[PDB]
Amino acid sequence: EIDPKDLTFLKELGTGQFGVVKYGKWRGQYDVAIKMIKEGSMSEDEFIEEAKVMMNLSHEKLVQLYGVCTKQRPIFIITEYMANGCLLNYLREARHAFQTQQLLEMCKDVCEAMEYLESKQFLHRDLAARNCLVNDQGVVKVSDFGLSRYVLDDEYTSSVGSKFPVRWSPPEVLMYSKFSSKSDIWAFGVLMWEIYSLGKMPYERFTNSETAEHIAQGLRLYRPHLASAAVYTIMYSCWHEKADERPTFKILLSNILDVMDEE
Ligand SMILES: CN(C)c1cc(F)c2c(=O)n(-c3cccc(-c4cc(Nc5ccc(C(=O)N6CCOCC6)cn5)c(=O)n(C)c4)c3CO)ccc2c1
Question: Which family is it part of?
């Protein structure tokens, strides 16, 4: 529990699932982002109990939760500040003119964070470039892990909803609501595709309904031009029709390190 007297609000960063997020300072020293949770958007009491677990998740490639303010409304969620914003928008800016080694390092940043979450048996459930952030050093960190569980908007949480992450979901999620470690693995492979595609929409010529059909047929995303055969093999391994045949994040990390050494 952070004392709100130790927060200063300085500029708006944008609006997400829970409303406005601001940039500010904590204890007159530390940059933070502060979510102001919009009334009616969150299952608040359930989140407040989970915040304890989520504060114990600490890894250099996870956007750190610093604390919450819950003895007031709106609730605040105070997190690490990531100066370069969302990875999706970052990938889409041609001025960065990334080398493929930089793209692979972004995949490795995310894979490290997800290997850590997997070790804690903790699912993200909405892993995608839009839910990763980039700091002032160009390090990519995974954000908003686990928070999908507290979203009250049915257009986001229902599989048939307009906001559901269809293009990052395996067939067993879309058909059966089967969530597991292996559904985050599937999403990771789509995220690698997004990175190597410089932020294209997965299945860019299909609708959500068509994508669900295409993947139920065994067909997959094509190799982005910037991906080598070895990088494509890694992302494609995340898309096995049988969940238990998909790698763990530990194996993915080893594969990524091998490609960095080879290429
Ligand atoms: C349930 N899931 C999956 C959720 C739940 C959420 F709460 C959110 C959420 O708040 N957001 C969300 C919404 C707003 C902000 C942040 C958000 C933005 C940050 N940083 C920046 C930095 C720079 C800029 C920027 O370039 N500008 C220029 C244009 O004018 C504005 C700022 C934007 N953001 C940041 O550090 N954090 C930690 C969060 C975030 C990320 O947190 C996004 C997805 C999301 C997903």
Answer: Belongs to the protein kinase superfamily. Tyr protein kinase family. TEC subfamily.
Q: Which of 64, 81, 98 is the last residue of a domain?
A: 81
Q: Are 143 and 132 in contact (CB under 8 A)?
A: yes
**What is the Å distance from ligand 1's center to 81 Cα?**
9
CATH number at residue 17: 3.30.200.20
CA–CA gap between residue 113 and residue 131 (Å, rounded)? 13
Q: Give the residue among 69, 22, 78 at the shortest CA–CA distance from 48.
A: 69
Q: Are residue 1 and residue 88 in the same domain, yes or no? A: no
Q: How was this structure determined?
A: X-ray
Q: Determine which helix (DSSP H) or strand (DSSP E) holds 10, and give its type and residue range.
A: strand 7-16
Query: How far apart, in whole angstroms, are the C-alpha atoms of residue 158 and residue 128?
Result: 18
Of 109, 126, 144, 184, which one is the catalytic site residue?
Answer: 126
Ligand 1 atom nearest the C-alpha of 147 is 1
Give the burial class of 198: count Cβ atoms within 10 A of its Cβ; 0-12 exposed, 13-18 middle, 19 or more buried: middle
Q: 3-class SS at 45?
A: helix
Tell me: cis bond preceding 171? Omega within 30 of 0 counts. Answer: no
Provide the domain limits for residue 202: 82-263
Domain count, the chain: 2
Resolution of the experimentally solved model in angstroms: 1.2
Q: How far apart (Å, rounded) are the C-alpha atoms in residues 161 and 158?
A: 5
Q: Which of 57, 81, 105 is the last residue of a domain?
A: 81
Helix/strand number for the chain, H first, E second: 9, 7
- 217 shares its domain with 248: yes
